[PDB]
Amino acid sequence: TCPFYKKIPGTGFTVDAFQYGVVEGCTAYFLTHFHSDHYAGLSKHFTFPVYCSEITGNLLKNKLHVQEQYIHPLPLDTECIVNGVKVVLLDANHCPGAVMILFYLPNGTVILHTGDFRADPSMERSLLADQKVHMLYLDTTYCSPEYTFPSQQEVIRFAINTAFEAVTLNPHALVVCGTYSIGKEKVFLAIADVLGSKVGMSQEKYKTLQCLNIPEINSLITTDMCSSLVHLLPMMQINFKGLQSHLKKCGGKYNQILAFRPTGWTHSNKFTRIADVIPQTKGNISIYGIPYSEHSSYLEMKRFVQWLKPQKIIPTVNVGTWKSRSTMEKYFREWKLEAGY
Numbered sequence: 193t194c195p196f197y198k199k200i201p202g203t204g205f206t207v208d209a210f211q212y213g214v215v216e217g218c219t220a221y222f223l224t225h226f227h228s229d230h231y232a233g234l235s236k237h238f239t240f241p242v243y244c245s246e247i248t249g250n251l252l253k254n255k256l257h258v259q260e261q262y263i264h265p266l267p268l269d270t271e272c273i274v275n276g277v278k279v280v281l282l283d284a285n286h287c288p289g290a291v292m293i294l295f296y297l298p299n300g301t302v303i304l305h306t307g308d309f310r311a312d313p314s315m316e317r318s319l320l321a322d323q324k325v326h327m328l329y330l331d332t333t334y335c336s337p338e339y340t341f342p343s344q345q346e347v348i349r350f351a352i353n354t355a356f357e358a359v360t361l362n363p364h365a366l367v368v369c370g371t372y373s374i375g376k377e378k379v380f381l382a383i384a385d386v387l388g389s390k391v392g393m394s395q396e397k398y399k400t401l402q403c404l405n406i407p408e409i410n411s412l413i414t415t416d417m418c419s420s421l422v423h424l425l426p427m428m429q430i431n432f433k434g435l436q437s438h439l440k441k442c443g444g445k446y447n448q449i450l451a452f453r454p455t456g457w458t459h460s461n462k463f464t465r466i467a468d469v470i471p472q473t474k475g476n477i478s479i480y481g482i483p484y485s486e487h488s489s490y491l492e493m494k495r496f497v498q499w500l501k502p503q504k505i506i507p508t509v510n511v512g513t514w515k516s517r518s519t520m521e522k523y524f525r526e527w528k529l530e531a532g533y
């Protein structure tokens with residue numbers, strides 16, 4: 193059944209709750225972003241109001257074929273009324289179109305639902321600065337102190353420098369980048385920009401990217417693989433067998449592959465710096481795992497929460513085990529005693 197952490201009390205609303213059939217008592221279904229564990233269940237047969245960003249609404253219409261009459265896109269940073277209740281959508285610094293949602297309950301309670309987010313100090317100057325938030329529905333993906341990772345900027349500088357050096361040393365090297373969802377577009381776009389190429393990809397992935405309102409996108413991507421020396425492939429193909437196979441397909445245009453796998457966290461984060469990352473190599477194929485995250489590190493999460501000072505925290509990730517739930521509740525209490533709220 194629908195878990196309690198997907199329901200907004202005092203309303204008829206749910207958040208990211210599309211796989212339970214008709215949730216009894218739900219008058220509006222909000223969708224924070226277009227990732228499959230969150231939209232799971234939506235299709236052209238859905239006949240309840242969906243509230244989301246413009247970009248998420250473009251993906252719902254073009255990829256899932258949800259009918260236009262049920263898609264209700266809202267502008268960001270704007271007070272809107274939904275079924276009698278004031279709401280605001282805020283940028284979540286996750287993937288394109290991802291939002292956090294502020295609910296102002298008729299009784300005076302204010303609720304923030306982060307969706308998935310990568311906390312940033314810029315959020316401390318949004319509309320959140322303007323009033324107290326009582327309850328926080330928090331993306332706790334990386335809520336443990338082992339999870340450190342570099343800034344997105346540091347990671348993109350590493351990728352751009354690595355690719356440019358390799359292709360300038362060998363003009364017959366191909367660059368390949370893995371993907372299995374929206375998000376992390378800066379990785380392949382920044383590498384293609386330094387190389388003066390468009391990124392080549394499948395018709396399905398091109399259609400997806402054309403929904404994202406990215407400026408000048410027609411100048412940056414293409415379905416013509418032959419004209420491109422940065423290719424995108426399914427993350428599943430980013431291994432030596434899949435890449436050897438891909439190289440055969442390019443008809444002797446290339447004699448070397450340099451590939452990137454933008455993972456979340458991996459245990460080499462506890463020991464190694466970004467300047468010291470090395471690839472896995474077999475023959476003329478090299479694969480780099482780069483720690484490009486679209487979720488909060490532990491320290492970013494802790495700074496946001498100690499700033500916001502909520503009265504109550506409801507985790508939305510890692511909630512399925514008693515050991516994970518107890519660990520998280522211990523950190524929440526530490527943070528509250530340290531900061532004095």
Ligand code: NI
Pocket residue numbers: 225227286308
């Ligand atoms: Ni997500």
